[PDB]
Design a protein around this ligand. Structure first.
Ligand SMILES: O=C1O[C@H](CO)[C@H](O)[C@H](O)[C@H]1O
Ligand SMILES: [Mg+2]
Ligand code: NA
Ligand code: NA
Lengths: 210, 211
């Protein structure tokens, strides 16, 4: 038996004064997640590019929790559909960071990707990154994953650039709102919103304000 | 450079002066044909240096100009630097080559419009409000020539002044220009009349464009 006492107001309320319906309750998903004792506890994906975007390095920092062992490995593999395009494998123990060493509980993988298919709102090219935590011999402990979009966002000479090109933001602010369910969101309404936006020449959305 | 007395009068009456080198090669094709040629650097330098040497003590002179309508050539860059080194007390401006070259401290276009772009290749005349905010641009803008007052003219003058007042970096301009360049000719009875280009048998000419 779970018991949850939800309070309408808290000191948190002072930071939640958005112009909208003030509501309350368990308004988003509840779930149970089982992880192994030796687990991936965090992972970051970065993509960086040469001057003309014809080469990329995918960089993945992976953090573990549990007991450190020489036989532990991480493999980050990158997939375009069913085709594996790049893969990297390494033991734990990052580069030296300061006078006391490095992170024995982290590793960074670096994968080369030639002529990457670039992500934008115009052509949302995605690769799949699978992060496997496993033994040197090949027994899987667990795997996590995310969608990867190869794209660079930077401000240069007063211009916001995506993949080196100045963006024109056709954006809209969007609150999470449904006339029947209040602030509970579902896939169908989300999809409906996305389709309408893009059908109406929007390319950008602001998470107003949370 | 003007008659020496002009600067003395501007000192005493109070007017700001842009003192300009006697250099205009407008007729060349392309406009910078001489000004990019090192063989013409000695001749150009003397028009710039001898001006500075003469006029540098006049407080009314607040800006040096490298000349007018001679494209932009490496000789301009050299002389820009000569003045900056010899007299740090005054900004240097020059309009040739698109009004915003490395040879000018001030964006100083001629006949750039307030809101409308004129995107000529190589030497575009941006709207002046747009020109200020072009990526990387930091300089003030003062038109070296605007509001062409030829005949029945100066329509839309207020529009420049509204913009000058609203935008800090739009710091005004120089109307083109002060006085009709007409000449006196006489009829058979000895009556004077105002003559322009072509009335003296001069050919080819450009008619009333001198006024
Ligand atoms: O400036 C604002 O005014 C809007 C009026 O609808 C709305 O309240 C936004 O949340 C707020 O940022
Ligand atoms: Mg508000
Ligand atoms: Na101003
Ligand atoms: Na004229």
């Amino acid at each position: 038996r779970l018991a949850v006492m939800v309070l309408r107001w808290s000191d948190g309320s002072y930071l939640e004064d958005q112009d909208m319906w003030r509501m309350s309750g368990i308004f988003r998903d509840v779930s149970l997640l089982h992880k192994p004792t030796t687990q991936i506890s965090d992972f970051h994906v970065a993509t960086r590019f040469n001057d003309d975007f014809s080469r990329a390095v995918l960089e993945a920092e992976v953090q573990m929790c549990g007991e450190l062992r020489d036989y532990l490995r991480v493999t980050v593999s990158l997939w375009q559909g069913e085709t594996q395009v790049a893969s990297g494998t390494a033991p734990f123990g990052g580069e030296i960071i300061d006078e006391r060493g490095g992170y024995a509980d982290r590793v960074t993988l670096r994968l080369n990707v030639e002529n990457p298919k670039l992500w934008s709102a115009e052509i949302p090219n995605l690769y799949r990154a699978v992060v496997e935590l496993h033994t040197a011999d090949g027994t899987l402990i667990e795997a996590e994953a995310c969608d990867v979009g190869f794209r660079e966002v930077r401000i240069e000479n007063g211009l916001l650039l995506l993949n080196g090109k100045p963006l024109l933001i056709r954006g809209v602010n969007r609150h999470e709102h449904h006339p029947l369910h209040g602030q509970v969101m579902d896939e169908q309404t989300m999809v409906q919103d996305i389709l309408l936006m893009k059908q109406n020449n929007f390319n950008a959305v602001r998470c107003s304000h949370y | 450079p003007n008659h020496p007395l002009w600067y003395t009068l501007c000192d005493r009456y109070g007017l700001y002066v842009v003192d300009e080198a006697n250099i205009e090669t407008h007729g060349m094709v392309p406009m910078n044909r001489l000004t990019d040629d090192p063989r013409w650097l000695p001749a150009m330098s003397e028009r710039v240096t001898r001006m500075v040497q003469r006029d540098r003590n006049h407080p009314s002179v607040i800006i040096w100009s490298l000349g007018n309508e001679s494209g932009h050539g490496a000789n301009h860059d050299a002389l820009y630097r000569w003045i900056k080194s010899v007299d740090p007390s005054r900004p240097v401006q020059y309009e040739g080559g698109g009004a915003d070259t490395t040879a000018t401290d001030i964006i100083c276009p001629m006949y750039a419009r307030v809101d409308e772009d004129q995107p000529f290749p190589a030497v575009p005349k941006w709207s002046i409000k747009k020109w200020l905010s072009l990526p990387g641009e930091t300089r003030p803008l003062i038109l070296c020539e605007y509001a062409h007052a030829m005949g029945n003219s100066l329509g839309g003058f207020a529009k420049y002044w509204q913009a000058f007042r609203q935008y800090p970096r739009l710091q005004g301009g120089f109307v083109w220009d002060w006085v009709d360049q007409s000449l006196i000719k006489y009829d058979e009875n000895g009556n004077p009349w105002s003559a322009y280009g072509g009335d003296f048998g001069d050919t080819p000419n450009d008619r009333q464009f001198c006024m």
